[PDB]
Amino acid sequence: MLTFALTIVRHGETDTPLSDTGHQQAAAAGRYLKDLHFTNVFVSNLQRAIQTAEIILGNNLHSSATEMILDPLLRERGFGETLEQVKTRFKMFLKSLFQRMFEEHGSALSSADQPVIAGLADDGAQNVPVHALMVSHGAFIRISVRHLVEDLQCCLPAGLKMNQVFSPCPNTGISRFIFTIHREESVLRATRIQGVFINRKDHL
Template sequence: MGFNLLGVAFASDQSGSRSILCKQHSRTLYENFTSTREDVACRGPPEDLLIRWPWISHRPKPVLTFSGETQCNKDGLLQGQKIDSPLSEIGIQQSEAAGQYLRDVKFTNVFVSDMKRAKQTAEIIARNNRTCPDIELVADPSLKERSFGIAEGGRVIEMKNMAKAAGQPLPEFTPPEGETMEQVKVRIKGFLKTMFHRIANEHQDKIQDGETSLADETDRAQAGLPDDGVLNVPVHALVVGHGAYMSIAMKYFFEDLKCPMPRGLDPSQRYSICPNTGMCRFLITLKCNNVDPALSDLKCVFINRRDHIKA
């Protein structure tokens, strides 16, 4: 079973294993989400579940996909977790534009951070959707923004100065009482596991037995359309989160999980700052057995798309 993750993207089992097909098999990914190869070997051949997942980050704002702008963003203040700001007027306009851009994309699941700015963004996008305006929004605290400890509420430039004084790049710097990148990765892994389980349980009817062959849309140039990469994929999840959190998720996808880059994309763009309501899309393949769905493969369709706010 496969699904589309916008911003990023299963199968269940009775006697064999099932997978969310995101297309080529990756041993690295497989071993990251299963116990041992020996244990997997006795489960039999996989069944496939293909899911496309768009991941919208919220900027304080985020990555895979961002939420809209807040007044704190505009004022150059660091929000993190302690400052739970609503969207500014511009943030609302950005979210409306994102909703219009995605209005014909049929989402099967929506996951969102439990912080105000992300929830507002998700609500606006869902309200604009013509295929699923009443879809349930699943709020998950594991999607919260990265905590910046004592730096929260201060100016972003102040944290930049703190990082410089510590001799560390800003993304890798952890202020006192803040979350390290590794701690955020633990939350990302926890969210993925929860999402995989929920999608596998809710979409068992879309699981396919045996090998699944789909045209690899990540290997061709994208047309810049809202439905790039979503053809023939039965499950499409939207994830709305935050900037720093999403940046770490991108690092986790591309470095830890060895996700290949989309054709024609400059590798240096992988970790560039995603704009508010910027979008990334990934294709994920999961192997599902009678214990846990396990990530088998991951491919990126596009990152940091902002066509809806170019004007």
């Protein structure tokens, strides 16, 4: 059994690079996330996402030894790719994610009540040492959240409006889920998924 945190961030304002505003959004998000240790980083192959990830990491106090992995599965919906096709890509990404986390961190590391949500950057992950950062695109992230919340067994905390849960993500909007996974019949499955916060933009 392994529990890990996933922080999800939409790229900054924009294979185009970030705008100047984009850079500043990403730096603000980096400063917001600076005291978090990301043990793993995953990012779409698109420059706007890579630069956002680079800026977040360049502002981080703990994650210097963490390598950024580019994953095409995180690319934006092809504008024409169906919503189901995008969801399938997220399902494939999750499969990859569980396997990677289990292989690297194993089952002797972090082995359904409300997480502690204080409106701070480390909400729900204070005591969760394994923490992955995913930097991706707005339509993909929206579809990914629907999948996590609707299609899978999922917990959502007190006072979180469904309107917010399903809202479109702002540039550098931040979301967080906590996953618990275990190997059932040789296949890795999530036993619990806990939503913490969705599309947070306090840093803007």
